[PDB]
Structures are given as structure tokens and as C-alpha cells.
Write a protein that binds this ligand. Structure first.
Ligand SMILES: Cc1ccc(C(=O)Nc2ccc(CN3CCN(C)CC3)c(C(F)(F)F)c2)cc1C#Cc1cnc2cccnn12
Lengths: 402, 470, 92
């Protein structure tokens, strides 16, 4: 029966406004027949496959409630998403159990046939944790990014809860009863991980569709291991509440100075890019909230200039790995706490280059050609000068009080 | 060590999160004492001690890294009592007392481990009948447990952030019901209780001396409710007084209106509200076997009879009185000393479904004690035999049966803490009499379902991996 | 209703070189409009060169009427062209 044509007539009659009609005995017989064919649950899986091959989300819910392995088969979710389907159907399939690998393959499919609705439906399952208030799109290889996708992911407090229909659940309840009788007889999102998605630009985030009002409350944006080249300035001013911005392992070529215009930026990380050959921070920009700065493994050939006037209260200045020739301009960061110039080309530090930084505690200068150590602040606690040509312990380090 | 635990993601609902690694580069901080003594080879039964140390570090969030102390005391962290017991288990000196690895994983597989948040014992062990949470979202996240211990009443006050409590006797006789009312416009908050003397007393939470006494009734007050206004009152002779929220500030206040829903042969036990917002103007109450509803005008708008239940259900359980009424799309009814739950509809005023908790329980006395609902379509059934049931309102089926944590569940409130998080307090008995107040995470049913699906997916992955390797 | 004259304008523009996708649009219209749009669905040229739904729609449109002389020959020319484009089309 289910082999030849049972679905083609049953779904047609039960979905053609079978409710809202004084056909109580009629529905009773159809549900009796349903409970009769409900045995041999393999057949139920066949019915689900046929009910998904067509776009009839009214009865798929009933099949799922009676118990149908949504991970039966090109799995079901990839099939439904390949052909043009309805958001209700993919939602009902995601709510029921379906393998994560299948959902990932379905996301790739829906990425191919660009459809914001199914994309958001899937990302709300793969990469959203409401407890943490974080989007976790890390490593999905989404070659692009569109605000129309991340739209419904953000809470969007205007939305509410409404039971659109209940006919499927009641239908499921009565067929289950008949089978039993036959047997007896605020809270915004504060993170957005887009790392390692093989991006190439984020220009599509500008006056975004309902995402602009939500980016104003972001407090972290991991964009690392992508391949960007710039950071859109309109995004810099929109992100009015960031504290942690990550841009390492991208492909940058010059430091965007306007990054330091963000109202609350406090941990900037542009490392392992090809930035160079010199970072010049513009004196008109005053960033008193930047309490970390990682310019490691770039191609810098100087210390970032104007660092005292611009990044006033800096704590950790990490310039490891760059090719810095040799310091000549004294740092004036009154609040520095950890300097790191390891793996550079320095051969001699200027005799008063660290005298005007009275809070230095850590100072790493490995893998240089250092031979003499100049006057150091007395607060220096850790001092890691390794692999760097000292013929004798300097006299300036034997007098460090702590 | 944590140095050997790699993380492949940070999304909680991921199939693969943590892995193990041995870089091949024991450690003093992370070794068993038997291993430190140079006694024998490492052995399986010492890895469990190392794993207990790792669990301690995860619980304390790496605090120890930067004879083990109390995790909650030495460092700041939420209790998580099931894991504290597991830690104290797998860190015992005698290695024969350490659980085997399969057992450790088996007890790490329970949703009651993730969801149980705080478990507080009461040392006095007094029979605690009622309790009311503090509707204040301030630092005074506390309860106001009412109980009966003498010819007069017993008044506890258990603070959550402190886990210590103060007891008092400020009523003239035992109390049966509590209620709290907070008027932010006047910044006044009062705790009103129903005393078996046959009166009502007010105690202002701002000052322990600001006390009043209210109008007297011939029987003992059995239930109270505050609607957010008007203060609902309920006696045992079928009386329904309304108290204005503001008028009760003064002593000897007057009831704005009084209805006699019923008679002395029928007590009024439960008053509730409709969960759906479209029906926010109906309050339901059970006077004996009458499921009556009265509108915002305090006039009865429907009057069902429950004596019809004996025609289908057993007469023995039918001729009891109503305990609770859980208002939703369908009315949920619990009757005294009855293991069966009745489901009614508002419109047709007739029975729609029955729930035989004995089936679920025997599948594992089974007397029903309390009913609670969450808008997530999970109705929590607290059975007097000390077992909680989780029913899904869409299918009316079992989710999981929670037991072996108390012997007799007394009451079960839903409440919020000062961290804006919603929890479900379960005050249960422990007759070895001892009263234990477990504070469950409101997401217990979702946790059960998600963890089941998650462990099944991981089992499938491991099975497939074993097959392709062979 | 305007989709008929819209497909007429489409038939007008397909003669221009480098008409390139518009195949999904006209496919959705044909799935929406069974009779009138299919009468001009002969304008469907080599587009998309893998969705089985498109071929199913084509054959189902041909069979649903199966009594109009011109649409039969037009659809046969179309299916001949697309099978010449891909031999895997014959399997499906
Ligand atoms: C490159 C690499 C090489 C080797 C191993 C390794 O752990 N091998 C291993 C050797 C033996 C054993 C079993 N023995 C246990 C001891 N026992 C005394 C004898 C039996 C096991 C075990 F997993 F089964 F336990 C593993 C791991 C890595 C890694 C990595 C990696 C990947 N991502 C990151 C990110 C940061 C850092 N590392 N990292």
C-alpha cells in the first residue's frame, strides 16, 4: 500500500483542509488507517522521505512526533535543503535529532543556492549558544558573510512566542491513542567568532539589515585566520562597545590607524600579518583605553612611532618576530608592564630608552645580537635575555633591586 | 594535567569538544599520594585520582594551579554539589575506594549532575510545611520558610548567598500557608502567613519590629496568593477575602470584598493564575471538588464539579479534595492522597485526560504531592514518595523520573535568584526527619533530552570509527 | 498574472547575445503557472551548464497537458538540447 501510491492520496486528503469540518468519523477512520500502517517503522521512514520530497510541512511534524528516524538516509536535511523548501520543514527537521555532519553539509548546500532564510535557520542550530551570548561561526568555511544571515541569530527582542498551529500535535495524539487502542484490542550577543571561515572581506557589514543596532553592543570579534586586507571604517565607528578585537593570521599590509578610534577598544591584536615596514600612529588619535597591543611576526622595521602620544596607557607591547634594526627613540609609556622584543635584529639598545617607563616588570629580548644592557628601571622582575651574545653579565643587571 | 587536554571548540552543544594528549616531553602537583610515596606502578586506580584533581581544577577554574581544601570556600565558585561528591569520592586515600573509570563516566552522564545547583540541609530538621521566595532581585536572595513546630508557629528565614538561617516563633499557632507582597511605589514589602489559630499576620521585611494583625475568620487559613493589585485569601470553610495591597500596610486592615465560594465541608486549597497572557483576567481556585474561576471583578464566572470523576476513575481517589490547580490550555488537577492526575478543559467543563503516575513509578507509595508547570511544556509532578516526574505537555509522556535525593517531596516553587536566573526550589523530606531544599536549574528537561542525544551521537561516532579502523 | 507578458519580454531578450541566473526564476514561474508559461517555456535555453527538480518540472509540464501539439515538439527540442549538453541527463 505504502509502496504504490498511499502517500499521494493520504497527504492530499489530510492536508486539503481536513480540519475545520464536521467529519469526525471521517478523520477517525483515517487515523485508524494511519495507526494501522504505523507498524513496521521502516515504512514510517519511507513516509517521511516521501513527505519531505514534497513540500508538505503539515504532516512531517506528525510523522516526527509518532517517531521517525530523521537521520535515516545524502541525508534527509541535505535533500530537503537541496530542492526549494519551506523554512517550517527544515526547522522541524533541525528540532528533531539529525547528525551534525549532515547539518554541516546542508549548510554548505544552502550556501551554494543563496537563501538567507535557510542559512539563518541552520546557523541558529550550528553556531548559537544563548547561555554564553555568543555566535560561534569558527571554521565553517563560509566564504562570505551577509547581515541577512546573522539577522535572526541576534535576539531581536521585538520577536515573541506564538503557537501558529496545533493540528499536527493533536492529530499525532489521536493516532497514538488509536494505535494504543488497536494494540490493546536585554541579553545582547557579546561575541561573534568569524575566525577561520576563509573570508576575503567584511565589506557587506555596513548600515546592515537590523545587524547595525546589534553590533553596537558587541564586546569581542574574533576575525583571525581569515584573509582580510582592510577593516571597513564604518564598522570601526559602528562597533561602539568592543574590547577584544582579533585580526591575526590575516593578510594585512598597513595598520589602519582609525582602529584606535573605537570607543572602548582594549586589546588589539594585529599579529602574523605582513604589516610593514613601519607603523606610524597618527598624533590626532588618542586611544587611552588600549591596554594591550600585539604587533608580533609582522615585517616592522621600527618601533611603532607616536606610541606615547597615541596609546597613552599601554600595558603589554609585544613586538616579537619583527625585523627591528635597533632602538633609537626612548619609549615614554608611563604604564608599560610587559615589553617583548624577542626574535628581532637589535644589536644595542639606546642608553636611556627605558628610563622613562618606570613600571616595567617583564622584558624579553631573546634571539637578538645584544651585547650590552643599558640602564633599566628598578621594578624589573623578570628579565629573559637569551641566545643573544653576552660575553659577560652586565653590571646594570646585577643592581636590580627585585 | 590540564596541559594534556585539548579543546577543539567552545560551543556547548558540540559532538567533540575535549580530547586527551601525551606529548611525550609524575608531576608533583598532579600526582596521587600513593604514586608520590614511590610505592608501586601507576595502575588504573590512580588515574582516577589524577582525574579527580583535573575535575577540581575545572571546578575551581584553574585557581589551584596559580588534604584538598573546600572548593567553595578556598576559592569562589558555585557549589555544584554532585561533582563535589564525585571529587571527594575519587580522591580517597585507599585506592580500592576510588571508583573505576567506567563508573566515573557513568555518574558523569546524569542530567541531575548538570542541573542540581545547591542542596541545603536544615539542621533543626523541623517539619516544614510552607515556604515563599523573596520577590526582590536584590542581594537579599533568600527564602522565608514557614513551618509548624509547637502550639505556636515556627518561622525560619534561610538566606541563599549565606546558606545559614534564623528561626523564630512569632505566630500564636501553627502556620499552613505563606505569601509575600512588595509595593515598589511605597518601597514596602510584607510577608503574610496563614496561622492555624484562625487569623492572618503581617511582618514587614524592612523592620523586624513592624508587625500587624489582620481580620479574623472562624477556620484556619489554608492558602494565600498575591496577584500582580489585590491580595487573595483562602480559608478552609470556603471563604474568599480580597485584601487591597496598599490597605494592609496598616494593622487591622479591611477586606475590600469577601466571597463565600463554598462551605465548611469543603476547604479552599489552591489558587493559581492562567499561564497564557490572553487569559490574564481569570483566577482559578479549588474549593473541595469545585474548580471555580472568578474574573478580575472577584465574581465566579465558571463552576465545575469534580464529583463526576468517580464515573471513570476510582471512587476511592475521586472523593478526596483538590490539592492544586495548574491553569493552562487544560486544567491540571491533583486531589488529596491520589496517585492520579486529572486533566480538564475550561470550555467544555469536562474530563479530557487522566495520568496514572503509578505506571511511570512501577516502571522503575507514589502519592502525588505538588504540581508545577514551566512555559517550556514540562509539567513537574512532585510525588509524595520522593520522586519528581517530568511530563511534556505536547505528548503527555514521561521525560525522566528524578529520585534518590529525598524521601518525600513536600512543596515545589519556581523562583528567581539575585542573578536573574530562574530556578525551581524542591523542599523534600529525609526520614532516616530531615528537610532538604534542592535548587534545580529550570532547564532540567532540555538538559535530559540534549544529553541523551549527545551521548548517542558520540556513541555512533565511536562505533563508526571502530568499524572503519577494523 | 503579469508573468505571462513578462515571459514574453524574456522571450524577446533571449535572442540578444550573452543573455547571462534567470533559469531559476522562469522555473519557479513555470512551477507556479502550469499552462500559459509552459506554452512559452520553449525559450528555456542552455542554462545551468544539476537540480533533478528542474527536469522533473519539465517532464511533468510536458505530461500534465500532453495534448498541445506545439509544446510537445518544443519540449522535445529542449530535452534533446539538454541531453546533448549532458549524457547524465538521460539517467534521471
Ligand atoms: C603532534 C602530536 C604528536 C603526538 C601526540 C600524542 O599525544 N601522542 C600520543 C602518544 C601516546 C598515547 C598513549 N600513551 C599514553 C601514555 N602512556 C604512558 C602510554 C600510552 C596517546 C594517547 F592519546 F592515547 F593518550 C597519545 C599529540 C600531538 C598533538 C597535538 C596538538 C594538536 N593541536 C594542538 C594544539 C596545541 C598543542 N598540541 N596540539
Amino acid at each position: 500500500l505504502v509502496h504504490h501510491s498511499f502517500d499521494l492520496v493520504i497527504f492530499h486528503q489530510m492536508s486539503s483542509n481536513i480540519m475545520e469540518q464536521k467529519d469526525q468519523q471521517f478523520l477517525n477512520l483515517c487515523c485508524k488507517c494511519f495507526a494501522k500502517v504505523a507498524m513496521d517503522d521502516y515504512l514510517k521512514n519511507v513516509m517521511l522521505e516521501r513527505a519531505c520530497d514534497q513540500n508538505n510541512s503539515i504532516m512531517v511534524e506528525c510523522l516526527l512526533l509518532l517517531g521517525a528516524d530523521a537521520n535515516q538516509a545524502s541525508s534527509l536535511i541535505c535533500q530537503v535543503c537541496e530542492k526549494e523548501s519551506s523554512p517550517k520543514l527544515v526547522e522541524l527537521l533541525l528540532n528533531s535529532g539529525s547528525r551534525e555532519q549532515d547539518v554541516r553539509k546542508a549548510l554548505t548546500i544552502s550556501i551554494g543556492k543563496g537563501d538567507s532564510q535557510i542559512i539563518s535557520l541552520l546557523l541558529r542550530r550550528l553556531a548559537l549558544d544563548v547561555a554564553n551570548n555568543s555566535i560561534c561561526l569558527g571554521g565553517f568555511c563560509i566564504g562570505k558573510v551577509e547581515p541577512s544571515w546573522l539577522g535572526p541569530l541576534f535576539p531581536d527582542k521585538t520577536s515573541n512566542l506564538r503557537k501558529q498551529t496545533n493540528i499536527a500535535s493533536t492529530l499525532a495524539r489521536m493516532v497514538i491513542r488509536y494505535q494504543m487502542k488497536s494494540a490493546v484490542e536585554r541579553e545582547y550577543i557579546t561575541s561573534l567568532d568569524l575566525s577561520a571561515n576563509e573570508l576575503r572581506d567584511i565589506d557587506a557589514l555596513s548600515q546592515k539589515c537590523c545587524i547595525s543596532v546589534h553590533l553596537e553592543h558587541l564586546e569581542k570579534l574574533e576575525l583571525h585566520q581569515n584573509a582580510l586586507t582592510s577593516f571597513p571604517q564604518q564598522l570601526c565607528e559602528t562597533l561602539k562597545s568592543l574590547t577584544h578585537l582579533d585580526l591575526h593570521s590575516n593578510k594585512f599590509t598597513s595598520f589602519p590607524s582609525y582602529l584606535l578610534k573605537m570607543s572602548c577598544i582594549a586589546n588589539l591584536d594585529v599579529s602574523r600579518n605582513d604589516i610593514g615596514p613601519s607603523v606610524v600612529l597618527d598624533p590626532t588619535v588618542k586611544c587611552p583605553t588600549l591596554k594591550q597591543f600585539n604587533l608580533s611576526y609582522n615585517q616592522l622595521s621600527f618601533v611603532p612611532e607616536n606610541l606615547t602620544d597615541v596609546v597613552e596607557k599601554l600595558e603589554q607591547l609585544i613586538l616579537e618576530g619583527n625585523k627591528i634594526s635597533g632602538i633609537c627613540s626612548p619609549l615614554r609609556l608611563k604604564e608599560l608592564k610587559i615589553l617583548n622584543l624577542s626574535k628581532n635584529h637589535i644589536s644595542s639598545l639606546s642608553e636611556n630608552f627605558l628610563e622613562a617607563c618606570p613600571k616595567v616588570e617583564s622584558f624579553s629580548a631573546r634571539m637578538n645580537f645584544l651585547a650590552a644592557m643599558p640602564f633599566l628601571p628598578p621594578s624589573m622582575t623578570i628579565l629573559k635575555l637569551s641566545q643573544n651574545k653576552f660575553s659577560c653579565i652586565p653590571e646594570a643587571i646585577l643592581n636590580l633591586p627585585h | 594535567k590540564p596541559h594534556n587536554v585539548l579543546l577543539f571548540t567552545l560551543y556547548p552543544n558540540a559532538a567533540i569538544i575535549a580530547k586527551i594528549a601525551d606529548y611525550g616531553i609524575g608531576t608533583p602537583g598532579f600526582r596521587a599520594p600513593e604514586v608520590a610515596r614511590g610505592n608501586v606502578i601507576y595502575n588504573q586506580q590512580a588515574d582516577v585520582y589524577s582525574f579527580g584533581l583535573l575535575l577540581y581544577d575545572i571546578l575551581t577554574t584553574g585557581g589551584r594551579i596559580v588534604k584538598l581544601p573546600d572548593p567553595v570556600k578556598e576559592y569562589g565558585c558555585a557549589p555544584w554539589p554532585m561533582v563535589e561528591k564525585l571529587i571527594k569520592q575519587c580522591l580517597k586515600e585507599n585506592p580500592q575506594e576510588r571508583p573505576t573509570s567506567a563508573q566515573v563516566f557513568d555518574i558523569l552522564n546524569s542530567a541531575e549532575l548538570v542541573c542540581l545547583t545547591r542542596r541545603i540541609l536544615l539542621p533543626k530538621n523541623v517539619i516544614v510545611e510552607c515556604m515563599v521566595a523573596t520577590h526582590h532581585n536584590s542581594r537579599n536572595a533568600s527564602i522565608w520558610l514557614g513551618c509548624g513546630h509547637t502550639d505556636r508557629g515556627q518561622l525560619s528565614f534561610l538566606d541563599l548567598n549565606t546558606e545559614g538561617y534564623t528561626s523564630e516563633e512569632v505566630a500564636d499557632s501553627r502556620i499552613l500557608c505563606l505569601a509575600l507582597v512588595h509595593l515598589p511605589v511605597e518601597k514596602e514589602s510584607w510577608i503574610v502567613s496563614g496561622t492555624q489559630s484562625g487569623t492572618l499576620l503581617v511582618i514587614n521585611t524592612e523592620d523586624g519590629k513592624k508587625r500587624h494583625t489582620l481580620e479574623k475568620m472562624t477556620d484556619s487559613v489554608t492558602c494565600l496568593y498575591c496577584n500582580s493589585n489585590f491580595l487573595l485569601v483562602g480559608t478552609a470553610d470556603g471563604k474568599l477575602a480580597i485584601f487591597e495591597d496598599k490597605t494592609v500596610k496598616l494593622k487591622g486592615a479591611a477586606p475590600l470584598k469577601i466571597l463565600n465560594i463554598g462551605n465548611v465541608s469543603t476547604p479552599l486549597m489552591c489558587l493559581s493564575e492562567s499561564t497564557n497572557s490572553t487569559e490574564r483576567n481569570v483566577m482559578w481556585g479549588g474549593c473541595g471538588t469545585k474548580i471555580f474561576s472568578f474574573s478580575n471583578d472577584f465574581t465566579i464566572q465558571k463552576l465545575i464539579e469534580t464529583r463526576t470523576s468517580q464515573l471513570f476513575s476510582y471512587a476511592a481517589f475521586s472523593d478526596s479534595n483538590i490539592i492544586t490547580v495548574v491553569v493552562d490550555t487544560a486544567l491540571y488537577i491533583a486531589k488529596q492522597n491520589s496517585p492520579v492526575v486529572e486533566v480538564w478543559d475550561k470550555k467544555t467543563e469536562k474530563l479530557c485526560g487522566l495520568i496514572d503516575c503509578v505506571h511511570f513509578l512501577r516502571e522503575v507509595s507514589g502519592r502525588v504531592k505538588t504540581l508545577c508547570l514551566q512555559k517550556n511544556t514540562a509539567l513537574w509532578i512532585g510525588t509524595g514518595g520522593g520522586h519528581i516526574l517530568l511530563l511534556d505537555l505536547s505528548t503527555r509522556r514521561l521525560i525522566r523520573v528524578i529520585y534518590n535525593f529525598c524521601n518525600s517531596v513536600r512543596v515545589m516553587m519556581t523562583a528567581q535568584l539575585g542573578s536573574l536566573k530562574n530556578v525551581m526550589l524542591v523542599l523534600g523530606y529525609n526520614r532516616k526527619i530531615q528537610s532538604c531544599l534542592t535548587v534545580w536549574d529550570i532547564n532540567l528537561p532540555h538538559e535530559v533530552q540534549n544529553l541523551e542525544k549527545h551521548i548517542e551521537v558520540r556513541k555512533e561516532l565511536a562505533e563508526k570509527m571502530r568499524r572503519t579502523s577494523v | 498574472g503579469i508573468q505571462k507578458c513578462g515571459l514574453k519580454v524574456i522571450s524577446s531578450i533571449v535572442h540578444f547575445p550573452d543573455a547571462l541566473g534567470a533559469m531559476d526564476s522562469v522555473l519557479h514561474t513555470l512551477q507556479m503557472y502550469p499552462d500559459d508559461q509552459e506554452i512559452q517555456c520553449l525559450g528555456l535555453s542552455l542554462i545551468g551548464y544539476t537540480g533533478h527538480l528542474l527536469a522533473k518540472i519539465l517532464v511533468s509540464s510536458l505530461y500534465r497537458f500532453k495534448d498541445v501539439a506545439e509544446i510537445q515538439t518544443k519540449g522535445f527540442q529542449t530535452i534533446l538540447a539538454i541531453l546533448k549538453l549532458s549524457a547524465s541527463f538521460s539517467k534521471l
